[PDB]
């Protein structure tokens, strides 16, 4: 009947678990779907974009950090475009500063110590929504899982969102694959697309449904919008 | 329960917590200080926690300037901290500007200014003691003061706070003239504390001073005439039992 | 709860936080000598994957004066630290080392302040500070977690306190000075480790306790070994 | 006293050629009566097909382009890659220029 | 009612505080949008409490550039620090750039504006405790993407529309619109649509007092109709109706 | 420096002040009212630095009309000129002070009488019968000293007045372009625009 | 919502807080003030009795604040001095920049201004103090002023403020001629204090005075704060045993 | 019992037991002091078939001669590896000389002293285990969150800390002399394997570090290559 | 749902609200405008009339020479929203010369009332309020109405306090929208029968003051108001 552990970010439950972060979770689960999958020549990021009405646009969820890196999103717009905003001064100070391209794991770092940060103090509440990074720095290619919790994990493919289950587990059998599509980008994404496609249940993606972004060998991050994903369908 | 605890307003007038500090004066130990004609006498009890503590290490009435001493009943802690910076206060804010010290009536408004901001403040509890400060200077003569943890203050003639008040204050009320010169006062002081006893009254376990004449001897120098001598004199554990003769 | 005057103004934080103190588990006794101190304290060593050496309840303070603390090890650390600063910031403030009597005053002082303000939680130690200084020779002070310190014949801390107390309070009662009539420090060690053995009807090998001893300006802990042969000293001539 | 300035003299020039421009500026860098390399670039590119250089003191002037390809780039990442017009870039650099009004850059810049 | 003070999230991963200011919006008199290949147009239900305040005082429609106009709804006082941080956000861009703001990135920056309230602040200061009562019809013209309109929502987000309303009767409009709007709508057209709707789900008997009309083109900017050209408008609209 | 009078009579006082404005070489205007009225009776003319002169003085002013009007009771010359003083005061020993030189004419209206205050830059107040800042004084003190007297009509001044300018003229290097002349007294302030004609 | 805070709006519009505070003042010693065509005068009964206090060389009810300006206290002991004490201080600003005496109205009203300030912000609680100013300005003569906590200050004729100043107030409303020369008044004082009081009879120790007035004599303004011998004797002239 | 700073009738504080409940929960961790230097272990879990192996590092050093690890909330032990990281940077610029460990401790143990002397903060969710060298010995330490720690000859927390324990309780006793610097890693190796045995349906990889002045040279260094295989299949075959 | 700072469910910020129901608790004033005038009356809570009639307050204040206010609610606020409004009524004038715009000063204040409704640890001002004036070298009449919550509203003639709801109506049903009150003398008039309803006899509790363009103002007297009573009762009687 009643639950006095779940006020701050601040208390512990009796266990030793922290309810408000749970939700952030969950809210995480409310949004939209989205994937990213790696190989050796590429990264990949698929997502969904969800309109309110009819009579409305379809609110995107890919963004740029830098020549070589970006993300998509599910959650939280605000909380989303802060965190990357925040990533993209980082990779500038060090370019600048140092004139060194950013590497993914060490984004990943400062991700997880921003975030962090949150469930330490008083006052304030959660960052509400999880992000699936991609980038191409010396070590090769590279993809991130990032939680709100501050847990951000090396892959090699995911999703994330509402019915992102599916997906997970076409990915987890198609893997010994795609991990192996190097030097051909148009595979990698048919590979991803069928992944996330593995996916809905309101329909079909459209050219206003659909959202793809790519970074590679020798491809500075670019996005594909609308009618430019038109063949991927 | 009611709208006590925090500072603020009970639906009549009466500030909450204010209360409930003095009555961490009422609870404490037993404390007086009479004015007389020439000279003021200021005494509390000294109950040892035990026999194993040589409680000859904690001064109760305490020197804040060579001409004023105070002393307390309440929150031992309270009383050791505030006086340290009731003694700068009356340096930096007086001595500091003037060259001189502070007369009585002023030092205890500086101590009571200090006693206030604790509590027009959340966040801060107030000083649980009352103080009686006991005091003189060269144009109002001598004093006799008492400060509540609520900042206010007043002017006796001669009193008692902690647990033996409702009697002492009573017994005291009979034993006064405003003719009796110091001895009498100190001979007086003993027969009121010695009701409010439950231990001991030997030397060692009794703590009093007293505003009276200058000790040329005290000073250390010679050679300026107007610089005389500290008036404050504690009394020790000697000069007192004697005193418990003439009964 | 909180900490804001209770009906009877008695606020329990700060009692409750003497529990606490006491709660750690280890008996701390403390006697003067007579040109040099000493404190007693247990060195229960639980757990056989620690290491007797990182474990203790007195630290070295300053050059003469040394610490010991019935209380619980993270918020002790913190106490040293501050007072272990205090004084060295002192000497360098004012031309001479800092005495026993007073660091427990700043520090009686500080955990008034702290206390009244809230700017944060009493610690839950009590702290026995020793040493001589030349002012008032063998000093020893103890301060309290409800901010306040006052003096000491000889002293204890401890779940039974008044046990090795009474003890001490009745040899006082007869060797009717102050203190422990005695030259060496080795022969008031003895004593004590004496005291106690008989206080708790316990007995202690070497490394099952903790001593400290405060000299003419140099104070040093008791190590494992110098600690047993006392045991040896005072084994026949009991 | 310190003396936070320096001349490495350089010579650059712009002319606006009917439907193209150019932005010429030789490759030599001096100090005293002395040479510190062949070859050093004083103009470049800064993307949105535009050219910049500023000559007088070297360390303020690639400062001031380093400050300013940065703040092309920003430019994109809040208004979706728009692409920054020319007048626009120039009254940008007056403020970035500006910023320095008493303690400036010591240099001629073109664009 | 557990799990309603700001900063909580519900155990869905939900924030009500935010929910609820929406639910002011709803308080606010009808507003609609409408975007034709041709311009925008912004028109608003007025309801006054007595003959005696004077219409043109309420601000429900107001200028933010010679190319961005505006239409709020709820609120009227935090209307007015979201249209004047938004005022300046633009003059601010054209000192800097000599060139216009992309109504889009300008809408950006009153989002941008809106969220940012903290409670205590968990690392970044923010003196305002709670969200806006109040969402935008920001409706403008780049050189970019044409004619634009958007919809301000206190949560921090936003969308772009074709045409959309806001206030009181949001569905009883919306619903029409769902279904009256098409691409090749011409201006005149556009504005006997808004029109209509707004006497539809409106309240009183329509009319110059109960009904501010405005609209911005890439010729003059945003104006906002006097009560002539409204007056008559709305002859061409009630006749209309008498055949079918 | 520029040109300053004044000079308190019988139930008056009169302001002269010189009107011309120069930069360096050229002359700009030269029809310039150096004066800026605080109150209906009080009135203040000054001289200074350039740009130091003409804030201060509308700063006062804005001080006094805001007291005049939330107690809706008129400040008296003696406390008004007290309080230009006091920010001077400070002013001096600020990060950078207001150079500025001013003389101060009011009718307390309790006292039924005129009264007159000198007051330079540094903060340095004095009621007096008659004053001039800066130069202007060496030229015509004498006269003044010579002439005055307390019992003088309104008139009576202007003449002595208009004397001491034909001096200034006579003997000054430079050329101040004339002057305008002000009235203060029981009934307020006054003009006496005809001092072009005159 | 009910009691708590000040930052507090009752749904009718009441600030309780305050309007505790506001009441507060039924507690302390019936304080008086009145008005004369030639002079004003403040008198006020003591509290805090018993048998072993001084009086004399000191006061607490009637403080002097400026040499033309007096009041009577009638609240908290430790705020009181507070507001005193910046009272005075500003008053003395006024002097040092305008060279001038400070007027009574504005006075009162600056003071009045920090008392409504506390009634306003979170973190701080009203002052409960009630004075009773009296004084003199050559701008609107002689002045009796009042004020309470919420910060509201007013002026009258002749009031009372503490305890029974329902009661004592009517009894002013009976004998009051608006010229009724001071003597006339210091008298009604005390009929008005007497019929008020819980001591057996009024006793000069508990009792405390003051009185301005100004002429052609003194040219200038004379204020007395009357000590503890003119007291025990003027008593006897309203005839007092 | 609910708030960070307060005290229990008797003296306790509550959200100090939950911190430690929650140290528990996590994967396990272990060092050990050997003959000169020390050797630091963790678990990190692999939940799926889409982890890279060798890449997410739950093990840091510090300056260049201090090994660590911890478990428990791993933000919380990420977060405070930076201050240690600061005090010991700060430290070397100010007396030249590589930070002592046993110091060092207490600059974190005072640290995560802090964070339970306050109610507007949440105390630290992790125990650490962390050692190094320098002129007088290797060391090795483990800190929980109340903030007190010690020196042991080998420690371990998270999930099952008495498996390595009671194995870690063998060791003393037939190597009383400390165990070779080389068998260290290949027993730690084991040790870990006999610990896992909860998340035994979910398979794992084992990550390595250690220190020695003969080994790694004063250093800190990844135990990864080919000593990191045979020291897997060391304990592959006790693994029966 | 009640300690405003937060929202009820269907979005309301009921502290904001109860502060307007201490407007209508306190005294009563109303505004109206000619084609030359603008007439602000107010009514006087003679209750405890034992105290000096010369120095003792008055809603009207001036603001500056050409603008004054009136409200209704709490005094003790009041005092401190007129004073912040005559600084800055002075603080333009200084850095702009050009003195301020009816409409500006209502902005200003109605930022004040609006500051005080954001800031956790602050309440709202219990005051709402008319103010009237002519712009500077302007004959157009202004009126505006501040409240509590921070909007401000121009109207052609309002009252504020308690029984507003009643005068209200007979302003309603009087002002001719179409042409206002021509001449001053029936401008004000008007605004006089109109609070003969809540006074209950007496032009001894009724306080007038006009407004003219370039800066000329000016209160009433008592017998002027009451000439007007007169001139009124009789029409009335007349019917
Ligand atoms: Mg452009
Ligand atoms: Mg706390």
Same mark, same amino acid.
């Given at each position: ?233 | ?247 | ?238 | ?111 | ?244 | ?198 | ?241 | ?240 | ?77 009041? =005092?401190? $929203?007129? %004073?912040?409004?005559?600084?800055? @009524?002075?603080?333009?004038?200084? *850095?702009?010369?050009? +003195? ?92 006089? =029968?109109? $609070?003969? %309803?809540?006074?209950?006899?007496? @032009?001894?509790?009724?306080?007038? *003051?006009?407004?003219? +363009? ?26």
């Amino acid at each position: 009947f009643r639950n006095n552990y779940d006020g701050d970010t601040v208390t512990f439950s009796p266990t030793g678990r922290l309810f408000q972060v749970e939700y952030a979770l969950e809210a995480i689960k409310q949004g939209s779907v989205t994937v990213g999958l790696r190989s050796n020549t590429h990264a990949v990021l698929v997502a969904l974009k969800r309109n309110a009405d009819e009579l409305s646009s379809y609110q995107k969820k890919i963004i740029k950090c830098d020549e070589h890196m970006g993300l998509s999103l599910a959650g939280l717009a605000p909380d989303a475009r802060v965190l990357s905003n925040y990533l993209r001064q980082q990779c500038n100070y060090s370019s600048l500063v140092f004139n060194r391209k950013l590497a993914v794991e060490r984004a990943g770092h400062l991700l997880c110590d921003k975030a962090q940060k949150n469930t330490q103090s008083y006052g304030g509440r959660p960052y509400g929504v999880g992000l699936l990074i991609i980038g191409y720095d010396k070590s090769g290619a590279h993809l991130l899982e990032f939680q709100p919790s501050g847990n951000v994990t090396e892959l090699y493919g995911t999703a994330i969102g509402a019915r992102s289950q599916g997906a997970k587990t076409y990915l987890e059998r198609t893997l010994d694959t795609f991990i192996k599509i190097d030097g051909n980008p148009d595979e990698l994404i048919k590979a991803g697309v069928e992944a996330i496609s593995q996916s809905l249940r309101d329909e079909s993606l459209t050219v206003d449904n659909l959202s793809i972004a790519i970074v590679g060998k020798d491809t500075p991050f670019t996005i594909y919008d609308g009618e430019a994903v038109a063949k991927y369908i | 329960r009611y709208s006590f605890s925090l500072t603020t307003f009970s639906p009549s007038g009466k500030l909450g917590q204010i209360d409930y500090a003095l009555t961490a004066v009422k609870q404490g130990v037993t404390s007086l200080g009479i004015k007389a004609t020439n000279g003021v006498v200021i005494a509390t009890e000294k109950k040892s926690s035990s026999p194993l503590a040589m409680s000859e290490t904690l001064s109760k009435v305490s020197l804040l300037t060579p001409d004023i001493g105070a002393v307390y009943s309440g929150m031992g802690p309270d009383y050791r901290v505030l006086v340290d910076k009731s003694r700068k206060v009356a340096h930096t804010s007086y001595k500091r500007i003037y060259g001189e010290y502070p007369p009585t009536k002023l030092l205890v408004s500086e101590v009571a200014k200090i006693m206030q901001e604790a509590t027009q403040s959340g966040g801060v509890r107030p000083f649980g003691v009352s103080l009686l400060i006991a005091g003189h200077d060269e144009f109002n003569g001598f004093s006799l003061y008492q400060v509540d943890p609520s900042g206010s203050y007043f002017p006796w003639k001669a009193t008692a706070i902690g647990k033996g008040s409702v009697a002492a204050k009573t017994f005291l009320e009979k034993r006064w003239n405003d003719e009796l010169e110091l001895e009498d006062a100190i001979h007086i002081a003993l027969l009121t504390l010695k009701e409010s006893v439950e231990g001991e009254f030997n030397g060692d376990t009794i703590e009093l001073a007293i505003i009276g004449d200058e000790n040329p001897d005290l000073l250390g120098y010679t050679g300026i005439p107007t610089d005389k001598g500290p008036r404050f004199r504690k009394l020790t554990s000697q000069e007192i039992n004697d005193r418990l003769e003439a009964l | 709860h909180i900490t804001i005057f209770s009906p009877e103004g008695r606020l329990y934080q700060v009692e409750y936080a003497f529990k606490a103190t006491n709660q750690t588990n280890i008996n701390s006794l403390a006697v003067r000598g007579k040109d040099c101190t000493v404190v007693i304290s247990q060195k229960k060593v639980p757990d056989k994957l620690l290491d007797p050496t990182t474990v203790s309840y007195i630290f070295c303070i300053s050059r003469t004066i040394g610490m010991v603390v019935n209380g619980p090890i993270p918020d002790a650390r913190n106490a040293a630290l501050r007072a272990k600063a205090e004084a060295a910031e002192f000497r360098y403030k004012y031309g001479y080392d800092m005495p026993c009597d007073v660091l427990a005053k700043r520090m009686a002082n500080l955990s008034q302040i702290y206390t009244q303000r809230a700017y944060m939680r009493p610690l839950g130690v009590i702290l026995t500070f020793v040493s001589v200084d030349e002012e008032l020779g063998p000093s020893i002070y103890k301060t309290d977690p409800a901010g306040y310190y006052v003096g000491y014949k000889a002293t204890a801390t401890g779940p039974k306190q008044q046990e090795i107390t009474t003890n001490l309070e009745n040899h006082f009662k007869k060797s009717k000075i102050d203190h422990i009539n005695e030259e060496s420090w080795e022969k008031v060690v003895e004593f004590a480790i004496t005291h106690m053995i008989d206080a708790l009807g316990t007995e202690f090998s070497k490394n099952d306790l903790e001593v400290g001893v405060a000299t003419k300006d140099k104070f040093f802990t008791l190590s494992a070994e110098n600690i047993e042969e006392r045991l040896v000293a005072i084994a026949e001539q009991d | 006293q310190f003396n936070p300035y320096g001349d490495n003299g350089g010579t650059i020039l712009g002319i606006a050629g009917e439907d193209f421009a150019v932005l010429a500026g030789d490759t030599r860098n001096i100090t005293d009566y002395s040479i510190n390399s062949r070859y050093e670039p004083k103009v470049f590119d800064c993307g949105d097909n535009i050219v910049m250089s500023a000559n007088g003191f070297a360390a303020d002037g690639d400062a001031l382009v380093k400050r300013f390809k940065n703040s092309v780039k920003w430019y994109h990442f809040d208004h979706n890659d728009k692409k920054l017009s020319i007048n626009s870039a120039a009254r940008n650099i007056q403020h970035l220029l500006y910023g320095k009004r008493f303690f400036p850059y010591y240099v001629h810049t073109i664009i | 009612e557990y799990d309603r003070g700001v900063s909580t999230f519900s155990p869905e991963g939900r924030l009500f505080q935010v929910e609820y200011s929406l639910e002011a919006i709803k308080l606010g008199s009808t507003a609609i949008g409408i975007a034709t290949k041709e311009g925008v147009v912004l028109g608003v239900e007025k309801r006054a409490t007595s003959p005696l305040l004077e219409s043109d005082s309420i601000e429900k429609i107001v200028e933010i550039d010679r190319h961005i106009g505006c239409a709020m709804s709820g609120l009227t006082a935090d209307a007015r620090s979201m249209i004047e941080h938004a005022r300046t956000a633009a003059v601010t861009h054209n000192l800097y750039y000599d060139e216009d703001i992309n109504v889009e990135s300008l809408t950006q920056s009153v989002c941008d504006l809106a969220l940012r309230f903290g409670e205590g602040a968990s690392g970044e200061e923010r003196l305002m405790s709670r969200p806006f009562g109040v969402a935008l019809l920001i409706a403008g013209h780049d050189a970019d993407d044409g004619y634009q309109l958007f919809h301000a929502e206190p949560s921090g987000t936003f969308y772009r529309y074709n045409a959309k309303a806001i206030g009181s009767g949001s569905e009883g409009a919306q619903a029409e619109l769902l279904n009256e709007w098409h691409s090749s709508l011409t201006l005149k057209e556009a504005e006997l649509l808004v029109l209509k709707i707004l006497k539809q789900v409106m309240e009183e008997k329509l009319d110059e007092n109960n009904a501010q009309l405005s609209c911005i083109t890439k010729q003059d900017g945003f104006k906002i109709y006097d009560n002539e050209k409204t007056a008559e408008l709305i002859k061409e609209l009630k006749e209309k109706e008498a055949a079918e | 420096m520029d040109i300053i009078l004044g000079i308190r009579v019988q139930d008056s006082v009169i302001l002269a002040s010189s009107k011309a404005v120069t930069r360096g070489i050229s002359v700009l205007k030269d029809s310039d009212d150096k004066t800026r009225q605080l109150s209906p009776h009080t009135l203040m003319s000054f001289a200074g630095e350039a740009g130091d002169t003409v804030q201060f003085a509308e700063y006062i002013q804005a001080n006094i009309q805001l007291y005049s009007i939330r107690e809706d009771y008129e400040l008296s010359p003696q406390a008004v000129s007290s309080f230009v003083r006091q920010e001077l005061a400070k002013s001096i020993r600020s990060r950078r002070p207001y150079q500025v030189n001013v003389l101060i004419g009011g009718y307390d209206k309790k006292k039924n009488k005129p009264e007159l205050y000198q007051i330079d830059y540094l903060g340095t107040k004095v009621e007096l019968p008659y004053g001039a800042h800066g130069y202007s004084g060496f030229y015509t003190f004498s006269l003044l000293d010579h002439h005055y007297r307390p019992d003088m009509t309104t008139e009576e001044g202007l003449d002595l007045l208009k004397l001491c300018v034909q001096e200034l003229e006579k003997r000054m290097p430079m050329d101040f372009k004339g002057v305008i002349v002000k009235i203060v007294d029981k009934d307020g302030i006054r003009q006496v625009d005809d001092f072009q004609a005159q | 919502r009910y009691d708590s805070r000040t930052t507090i709006f009752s749904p009718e519009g009441r600030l309780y807080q305050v309007e505790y505070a506001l009441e507060s003042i039924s507690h302390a010693g019936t304080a008086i003030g009145i008005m004369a065509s030639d002079g004003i005068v403040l008198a006020a009964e003591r509290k805090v009795t018993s048998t072993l206090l001084e009086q004399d060389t000191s006061t607490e009810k009637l403080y002097k604040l400026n040499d033309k300006i007096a009041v009577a206290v009638a609240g908290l002991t430790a705020d009181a001095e507070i507001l005193i004490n910046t009272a005075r201080i500003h008053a003395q600003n006024y002097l040092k920049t305008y060279n001038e005496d400070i007027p009574v109205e504005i006075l009162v009203r600056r003071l009045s201004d920090i008392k409504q300030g506390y009634t306003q912000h979170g973190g701080l609680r009203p002052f409960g103090v009630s004075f009773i100013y009296a004084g003199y300005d050559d701008r609107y003569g002689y002045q009796l002023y009042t004020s309470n906590p919420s910060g509201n200050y007013t002026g009258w004729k002749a009031i009372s403020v503490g305890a029974n100043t329902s009661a004592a107030q009517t009894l002013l409303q009976m004998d009051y001629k608006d010229d009724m020369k001071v003597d006339d008044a210091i008298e009604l004082a005390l009929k008005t204090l007497s019929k008020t009081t819980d001591s057996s009879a009024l006793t000069y120790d508990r009792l405390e005075f003051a009185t301005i007035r100004k002429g052609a004599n003194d040219g200038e303004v004379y204020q007395k704060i009357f000590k503890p011998q003119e007291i025990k004797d003027i008593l006897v002239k309203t005839g007092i045993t | 019992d609910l708030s960070n700073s307060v005290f229990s009738p008797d003296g306790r504080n509550f959200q100090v037991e939950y911190a430690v409940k929650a140290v528990e929960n996590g994967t396990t961790s272990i060092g050990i002091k050997c003959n000169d230097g020390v050797v630091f272990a963790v678990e990190k879990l692999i939940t799926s078939k889409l982890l890279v192996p060798q890449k997410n590092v739950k093990i840091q050093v510090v300056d260049r001669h201090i090994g660590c690890v911890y478990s428990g909330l791993i933000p919380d032990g990420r977060h405070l590896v930076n201050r240690g990281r600061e005090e010991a940077a700060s430290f070397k610029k100010l007396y030249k000389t590589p930070i002592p460990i046993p110091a060092f401790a207490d600059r974190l143990g005072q640290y995560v002293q802090a964070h339970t002397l306050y109610n507007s903060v949440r105390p630290f969710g992790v125990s650490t285990i962390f050692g190094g060298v320098d002129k007088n010995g290797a060391h090795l330490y483990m800190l929980e969150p109340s903030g007190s720690y010690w020196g042991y000859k080998g420690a371990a927390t998270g999930k099952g800390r008495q498996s390595a324990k009671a194995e870690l309780e063998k060791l003393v006793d037939h190597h009383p002399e400390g165990l070779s610097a080389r068998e260290a890693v290949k027993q730690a190796a084991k040790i870990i394997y006999l610990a896992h045995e909860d998340n035994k349906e979910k398979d794992f990889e084992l990550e390595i570090s250690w220190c020695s002045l003969s080994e790694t040279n004063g250093l800190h260094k990844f135990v990864k290559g080919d000593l990191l295989q045979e020291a897997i299949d060391f304990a592959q075959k006790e693994i029966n | 749902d009640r300690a405003l700072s937060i929202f009820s469910p269907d979005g309301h910020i009921f502290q904001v609200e109860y502060a307007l129901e201490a407007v209508k608790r306190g005294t009563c004033a109303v505004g109206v405008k000619g084609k030359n005038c603008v007439v602000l009356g107010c009514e006087r809570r003679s209750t405890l009339k034992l105290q000096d009639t010369r120095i003792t307050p008055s809603k009207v204040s001036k603001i500056d020479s050409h603008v004054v206010l009136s409200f209704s609610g709490l005094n003790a606020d009041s =005092r401190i $929203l007129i %004073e912040k409004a005559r600084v800055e @009524a002075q603080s333009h004038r200084l *850095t702009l010369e050009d +003195p301020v715009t009816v409409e500006y000063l209502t902005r200003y204040v109605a930022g004040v009332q609006q500051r005080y409704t954001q800031s956790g640890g602050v309440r709202p001002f219990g005051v709402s309020t008319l103010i009237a004036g002519f712009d500077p070298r302007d004959d157009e009449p202004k009126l505006y109405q501040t409240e509590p919550s921070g909007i401000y509203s121009s109207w052609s003639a309002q009252t504020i306090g308690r029984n507003s709801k009643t005068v209200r109506e007979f302003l309603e049903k009087n002002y001719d929208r179409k042409e206002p009150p021509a001449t001053v003398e029936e401008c004000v008039k008007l605004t006089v =029968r109109s $609070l003969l %309803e809540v006074v209950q006899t007496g @032009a001894k509790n009724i306080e007038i *003051t006009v407004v003219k +363009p370039d800066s000329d103002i000016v209160a009433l007297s008592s017998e002027e108001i009451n000439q007007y009573v007169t001139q009124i009762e009789q029409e009335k009687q007349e019917q």
